[PDB]
Amino acid sequence: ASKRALVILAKGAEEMETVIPVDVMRRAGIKVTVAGLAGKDPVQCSRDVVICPDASLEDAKKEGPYDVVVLPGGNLGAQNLSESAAVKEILKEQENRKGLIAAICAGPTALLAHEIGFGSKVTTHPLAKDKMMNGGHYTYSENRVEKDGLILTSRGPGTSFEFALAIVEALNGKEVAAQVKAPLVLKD
Amino acid sequence: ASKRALVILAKGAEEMETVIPVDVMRRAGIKVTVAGLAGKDPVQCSRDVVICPDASLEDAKKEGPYDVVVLPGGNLGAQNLSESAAVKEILKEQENRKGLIAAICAGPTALLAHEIGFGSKVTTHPLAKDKMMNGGHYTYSENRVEKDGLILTSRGPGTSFEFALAIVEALNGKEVAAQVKAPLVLKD
C-alpha cells in the first residue's frame, strides 16, 4: 500500500533540487529510490556536493513501476537526462500508464527532448524558457508550481519545497502534505 | 582574499540543512569544506540521503582558520556534535578569535553542550526550545533567523535558504547576497 518514487540523479544535477524532494517525500512515507543515471557510483552535483545513489538506474528500472518519476534540474544534469535513452524509455512508459512525471528548474527540458507530454502547461526556470518552448509544443506558465494532467513542473531551487509538497499532495493527499509541512517551518 | 566555511557533517544530520547552505555558499564564491565528524567515509543523513564529505574533520581542522563554522541540525546529528570533543575545541577556538558560528534547527543545542556564546539571543526549532533553554543561559527568539554578535541561528529546514543567505551577507556583504538570491527563485 506504499507509493514509490524514482528520482534520477545525473552528473551536474542541482543538489538542492535533488535532496529536498527526496527528504520531504520520505517524511511523507513514500519509498524513494535515488537512482544514478550512470551506475551505482557516487554523483558529483552541480555545486560539488557528492551524493551516493541508492541503486543504478538499470537496477531500479527493473523494480518498477513508480507512482512518480522525478527529474531534478541543474543545466548539465538536465542535459545528461535529455541525452539518455534509458530516461526516454522510462518516461515514455510512465506516460503510457498515466503515472506522474515531475521535473523542476531545467529538468523539464528533458521532457521536450524525449517528446513527453506535448500540449501540457509547464513552467521552467526563467533561463530555460526559450529552450523548453522551441517549437511551441507546450504552453508556458509563470506559476511557481504548475500541474497539467500528469505533468508537474516547477521553477527553481527556491521552489523546491513547494514542488515536493505538491508531489506529496498528488500521491498521498492534502492532509498528509499539511502534516509533513508543519514541522518544516516554512513561511507560507 | 577568499572566505572559508567549515560545515561539520555527522550521522543523522538533516540533509536539507546541510546541502542548502553548502550550495548557496558556494554560489557566493565561498570555499566550503564539508568535513565528516567520524572520518572521510560517506555519511547517512537523517532521511537516508548519503553524502561524501570533502575531508575528515581531523584534516580539515589543520587547514583553518575558517570565517564561519556551520552546524546543521537533525536531532541525532546535533547529539553527535554535542558529544564530540573535537567540535568543542573547534567551536571554542572560533569563539576566541571572534569568528562566526552558524547553527540551524537542532544544531544550536551543540552550543549549549559546549558552553558556547552564553548570554546571546538565539533561535532553534520549536521542538528544541526546552533543551536549548535548560539553565537560562541564552535568551530565546522566535525570529526565523537570529543574529547576536558572532552567533547566527535559525529554526528549521524551511528556513535553510534564509539562514544561508544571512551567512553570505555576513561574510561577503548585502550586494553579493542579493546577486546570489535572484536566480534561486525564492518568494520573499
Swiss-Prot record, chains A, B:
<dbReference type="GO" id="GO:0033234">
    <property type="term" value="P:negative regulation of protein sumoylation"/>
</dbReference>
<dbReference type="GO" id="GO:1902903">
    <property type="term" value="P:regulation of supramolecular fiber organization"/>
</dbReference>
<dbReference type="GO" id="GO:0003713">
    <property type="term" value="F:transcription coactivator activity"/>
</dbReference>
<dbReference type="GO" id="GO:0005739">
    <property type="term" value="C:mitochondrion"/>
</dbReference>
<dbReference type="GO" id="GO:1903136">
    <property type="term" value="F:cuprous ion binding"/>
</dbReference>
<dbReference type="GO" id="GO:0070062">
    <property type="term" value="C:extracellular exosome"/>
</dbReference>
<dbReference type="GO" id="GO:0050821">
    <property type="term" value="P:protein stabilization"/>
</dbReference>
<dbReference type="GO" id="GO:0019900">
    <property type="term" value="F:kinase binding"/>
</dbReference>
<dbReference type="Pfam" id="PF01965">
    <property type="entry name" value="DJ-1_PfpI"/>
</dbReference>
<dbReference type="GO" id="GO:0045296">
    <property type="term" value="F:cadherin binding"/>
</dbReference>
<dbReference type="GO" id="GO:0046295">
    <property type="term" value="P:glycolate biosynthetic process"/>
</dbReference>
<dbReference type="GO" id="GO:0019249">
    <property type="term" value="P:lactate biosynthetic process"/>
</dbReference>
<dbReference type="GO" id="GO:0045944">
    <property type="term" value="P:positive regulation of transcription by RNA polymerase II"/>
</dbReference>
<dbReference type="GO" id="GO:0010273">
    <property type="term" value="P:detoxification of copper ion"/>
</dbReference>
<keyword id="KW-1003">Cell membrane</keyword>
<dbReference type="GO" id="GO:1903428">
    <property type="term" value="P:positive regulation of reactive oxygen species biosynthetic process"/>
</dbReference>
<keyword id="KW-0225">Disease variant</keyword>
<dbReference type="GO" id="GO:0030091">
    <property type="term" value="P:protein repair"/>
</dbReference>
<dbReference type="GO" id="GO:0006281">
    <property type="term" value="P:DNA repair"/>
</dbReference>
<dbReference type="GO" id="GO:1902236">
    <property type="term" value="P:negative regulation of endoplasmic reticulum stress-induced intrinsic apoptotic signaling pathway"/>
</dbReference>
<dbReference type="GO" id="GO:0045340">
    <property type="term" value="F:mercury ion binding"/>
</dbReference>
<keyword id="KW-0907">Parkinson disease</keyword>
<keyword id="KW-0007">Acetylation</keyword>
<dbReference type="GO" id="GO:0050681">
    <property type="term" value="F:nuclear androgen receptor binding"/>
</dbReference>
<dbReference type="GO" id="GO:1903427">
    <property type="term" value="P:negative regulation of reactive oxygen species biosynthetic process"/>
</dbReference>
<dbReference type="GO" id="GO:0016605">
    <property type="term" value="C:PML body"/>
</dbReference>
<feature type="modified residue" description="N6-acetyllysine">
    <location>
        <position position="147"/>
    </location>
</feature>
<dbReference type="GO" id="GO:0051899">
    <property type="term" value="P:membrane depolarization"/>
</dbReference>
<dbReference type="GO" id="GO:0036471">
    <property type="term" value="P:cellular response to glyoxal"/>
</dbReference>
<keyword id="KW-0564">Palmitate</keyword>
<dbReference type="GO" id="GO:0042593">
    <property type="term" value="P:glucose homeostasis"/>
</dbReference>
<dbReference type="GO" id="GO:0036524">
    <property type="term" value="F:protein deglycase activity"/>
</dbReference>
<keyword id="KW-0346">Stress response</keyword>
<dbReference type="InterPro" id="IPR006287">
    <property type="entry name" value="DJ-1"/>
</dbReference>
<keyword id="KW-0496">Mitochondrion</keyword>
<dbReference type="GO" id="GO:1903094">
    <property type="term" value="P:negative regulation of protein K48-linked deubiquitination"/>
</dbReference>
<dbReference type="InterPro" id="IPR029062">
    <property type="entry name" value="Class_I_gatase-like"/>
</dbReference>
<dbReference type="GO" id="GO:0030424">
    <property type="term" value="C:axon"/>
</dbReference>
<dbReference type="GO" id="GO:0005829">
    <property type="term" value="C:cytosol"/>
</dbReference>
<dbReference type="GO" id="GO:0031397">
    <property type="term" value="P:negative regulation of protein ubiquitination"/>
</dbReference>
<dbReference type="GO" id="GO:0007265">
    <property type="term" value="P:Ras protein signal transduction"/>
</dbReference>
<dbReference type="InterPro" id="IPR002818">
    <property type="entry name" value="DJ-1/PfpI"/>
</dbReference>
